[PDB]
């Protein structure tokens, strides 16, 4: 209530208060959410007595969903309209068919709406009478926003009432454009995707929009790599030794993969090693002698790849982290003892070099320098730090916690709901706790990608990007986090290519903000004509564009695990096998490593590879497996191919 709408906010609603499907574009930090509120309030009051209208609000990321839901709840609490939400976190949700009808304003995460549409609980999209998309820029390709819009367009073009469509965005994006013409191509295609008709941008009140909204400045920091690194030398020499051992046993190793001029620290080397794994695994002989060859190649390749990952982790984190990674792998995990000795032979040297402070990673040193100067300048500041991956989040957290130099900082984390690769992220109450804490004692946030597209942590004076890059949409959303005035962004990187990419991205942004000024001069009906043309053409394209007993062997020791004709899917997702023979083909660990249920492991003492885990279903617990760990060989022919997920492989599925 106490908010007094600013001029440009009133200006940005008229095209949508009139009832035309619209796209609303304004710089980051404008009052888009408030504008959506005004549009919804004015649309709600229009219906005559006896007829009521539902509003839907999508939002694709959970923290954003909670923030938007709270804003809507507080604003429309007074009037008495009833708001609600359906998401993935809700447990044993009461029927969605009923919850939609009971409540007027529904906030969803779009994949829910697609679920219900395909299932048939919501019959037809005609129920809703307003749709609001909080990232108009995502509606393309096969993103769930676009699948909702596909259903809508299919309903309109062929042959009831159909709902109004709004979208809010701060940057519509240029796709693959090279000149202004290609940008216009892409922007018109976007507008066509969601039944657009008007693009609304601030023009009259630009003078005011400049005073209230502050554009943060940008800066680039290029960091010298080390003159000489001891860690890299030692590990690379170990890798070369292992590579020579790999060379010996197989007649040819280079031919298996076309990739060439491999370097030790790159991702290219990772691709080489994986392709070599997947090529050696399919070598066949006319039949027990080659088992030793396969096992050996498995081991050499595996340890080589793990050293590679160590080098990369070392590049992006403190050296101690890489040493910890390697030590943990060797603790957990014949030839194995040979290479265990080969690592322990040098381990003390690595421990020595790790703790010598003069070899501290230069990037992290620059991060310390920048944080220290900035926080000394203004003692009250809040920083966001964007990192590519989840492991780097924990590494940087450790680094901040126990560095004497950066005492002021008091970190917090923020990642996404899902749990992947032995790290598990925050749950919804945890995210709410962190964000409300910022509203407090915390003074720096460590985020993955999920904290883009509007987290709205006011009073941010510093965004730091730790080798973070992408298409211009990402650049605009990331640079816009610093809502507070006086804010800065620092792109901090070691590779010159990234520094170049950010400059070309700034140029692309300028081109986009020109090609959207151009499109506002067309007549009011040429737009509608060409949009209908694009919609129809794309509908035609999309509509017509769609219309035994193989033995399973071990990926590492090539022993007859089971047969396809003896696997019965259970509840259509978990997979299981039956028979006393299979119960002899593995030996469950008496005290499994996680303990937290028992895992599976290969029967032989020679081979111990992760076949699966054990889970309990109703009365009887059953053994489940993962296809990543087997190799399929035909019952008659000798063919062999590798399937990463169950979905590619096709067998005579029969229910439990």
């Amino acid at each position: 209530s106490p908010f007094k709408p600013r001029n440009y906010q009133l200006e940005l609603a008229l095209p949508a208060m009139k009832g035309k499907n619209t796209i609303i574009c304004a710089p980051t930090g404008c009052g888009k959410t408030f504008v959506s509120l005004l549009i919804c309030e004015h649309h709600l009051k229009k219906f005559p007595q006896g007829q009521k209208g539902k509003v839907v609000f999508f939002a694709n990321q959970i923290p954003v969903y909670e923030q938007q839901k709270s804003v809507f709840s507080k604003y429309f609490e007074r009037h008495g309209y009833r708001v609600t939400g359906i998401s993935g976190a809700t447990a044993e949700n009461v029927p969605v068919e009923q919850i939609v009808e009971n409540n007027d304003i529904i906030i969803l995460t779009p994949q829910i709406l697609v679920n219900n549409l395909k299932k048939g609980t919501i019959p037809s999209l005609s129920i809703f009478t307003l749709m609001i998309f909080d990232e108009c820029h995502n509606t393309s390709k096969q993103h769930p926003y676009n699948m909702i819009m596909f259903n809508y367009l299919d309903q309109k073009l062929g042959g009831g009432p159909l709902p109004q469509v709004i979208g809010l965005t701060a940057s519509v994006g240029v796709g693959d454009a090279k000149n202004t013409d290609e940008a216009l191509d892409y922007i018109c295609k976007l507008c066509a995707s969601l039944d657009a008709s008007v693009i609304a941008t601030v023009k009259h009140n630009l003078e005011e929009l400049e005073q209230v909204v502050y554009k943060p400045q940008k800066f680039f920091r290029k960091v010298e790599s080390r003159i000489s690194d001891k860690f890299k030398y030692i590990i690379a020499q170990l890798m070369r030794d292992t590579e020579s051992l790999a060379k010996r046993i197989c007649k040819d190793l280079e031919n298996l993969s076309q990739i060439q001029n491999r370097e030790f620290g790159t991702q290219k080397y990772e691709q080489w090693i994986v392709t070599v794994q997947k090529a050696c695994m399919v070598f066949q002989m006319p039949k027990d002698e080659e088992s030793r060859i396969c096992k050996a190649l498995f081991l050499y390749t595996s340890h080589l790849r793990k050293y590679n990952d160590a080098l990369i982790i070392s590049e992006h984190a403190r050296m101690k982290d890489a040493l910890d990674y390697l030590k943990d792998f060797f603790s957990n995990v014949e030839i194995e003892q040979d290479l265990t000795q080969r690592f322990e032979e040098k381990l003390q040297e690595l421990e020595s070099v790790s703790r010598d402070p003069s070899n501290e990673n230069p990037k992290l040193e620059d991060l310390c320098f920048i944080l220290q100067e900035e926080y000394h300048l203004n003692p009250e500041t809040i920083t966001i730090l964007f990192v590519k991956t989840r492991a780097l989040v924990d590494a940087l957290k450790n680094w901040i916690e126990g560095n004497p130099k950066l005492s002021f900082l008091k970190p917090g984390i923020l990642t996404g709901r899902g749990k992947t690769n032995q790290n598990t992220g925050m749950t919804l109450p945890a995210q709410k706790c962190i964000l409300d804490a910022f509203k407090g004692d915390h003074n720096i946030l460590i985020a993955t990608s999920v904290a883009d597209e509007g987290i709205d942590i006011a009073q941010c004076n510093l965004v730091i990007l730790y080798e973070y890059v992408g298409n211009v949409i990402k650049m605009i959303q990331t640079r816009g986090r610093g809502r507070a005035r006086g804010s800065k962004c620092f792109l901090l990187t070691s590779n010159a290519g990234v520094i170049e990419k950010e400059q070309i991205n700034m140029y692309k942004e300028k081109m986009m903000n020109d090609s959207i000024l151009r499109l506002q001069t067309w007549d009011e009906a040429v737009f509608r004509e060409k949009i209908l043309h694009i919609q129809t053409h794309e509908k035609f394209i999309r509509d017509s564009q769609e219309k035994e007993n193989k033995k399973l062997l071990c990926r590492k020791c090539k022993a007859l695990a089971c047969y396809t004709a003896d696997v019965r899917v259970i509840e259509e997702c978990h997979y299981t096998v039956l028979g006393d023979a299979f119960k002899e083909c593995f030996v469950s660990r008496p005290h499994p490593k996680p303990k937290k249920r028992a895992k599976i492991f290969c029967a032989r003492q020679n081979c111990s590879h992760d076949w699966g885990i054990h889970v309990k279903y109703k009365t009887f617990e059953i053994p489940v497996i993962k296809i990543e760990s087997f190799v399929v060989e035909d019952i008659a022919t000798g063919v062999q191919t590798l399937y990463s997920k169950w979905k590619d492989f096709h067998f005579e599925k029969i229910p439990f």
């Binding site: 800066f219 003069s358 320098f369 920048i370 100067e373 900035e374 300048l377 203004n378 004497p404 130099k405």
Partner: protein
């Protein structure tokens, strides 16, 4: 009469900061400048003079952002910020366009100008004077450290192109 001309040393120069050949001009480099790695280096965009002082006055001009000028002695730790550890007495221009003084790790708040340092441990007196068109009087206090004292400076290091230099006015 008691005026001296302190000269910046390469001993404590910070990687980011840079110095001129005349050795009376200090600025912030556009790019990092490599230097030997030692615990002597500040690791913060600061600098320490070399004219050890155990009746000395010296004038630094602050024309051409944020600056701290002060006196600190060799005991001070490199990683700690100038003016906020015990041994160091400094005058700083905050980021909120106010002029503050840090003495004996105590905050004391108080329009900018070109400033001097006048110290005499003979009576344990430390004085600052902001002299532009008039002999304006700045914060003055009492402080005595056993070790001989050195002039010191801190120049905001994220913003390239701000330089601090030393003026040797004459009688």
């Amino acid at each position: 009469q008691w005026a001296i001309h302190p000269t910046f040393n390469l001993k404590s120069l910070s990687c980011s900061l840079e110095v001129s050949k005349d050795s009376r001009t200090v600025t912030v480099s556009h790019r990092p400048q490599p230097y030997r790695w030692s615990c002597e280096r500040f690791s913060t965009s600061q600098v320490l003079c070399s004219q050890a002082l155990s009746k000395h006055y010296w004038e630094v001009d602050t024309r051409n952002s944020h600056w701290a000028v002060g006196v600190a002695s060799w005991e001070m730790s490199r990683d700690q910020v100038l003016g906020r550890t015990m041994d160091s007495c400094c005058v700083e221009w905050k980021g909120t366009s106010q002029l503050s003084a840090w003495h004996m790790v105590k905050e004391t708040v108080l329009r900018p100008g070109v400033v001097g340092i006048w110290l005499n441990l003979e009576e344990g007196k430390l004085a600052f004077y902001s002299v532009d068109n008039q002999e304006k009087l700045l914060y003055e206090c009492t402080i005595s450290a056993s070790s001989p004292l050195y002039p010191a400076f801190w120049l905001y290091g994220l913003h390239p192109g701000n330089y601090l230099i030393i003026k040797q006015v004459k009688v």
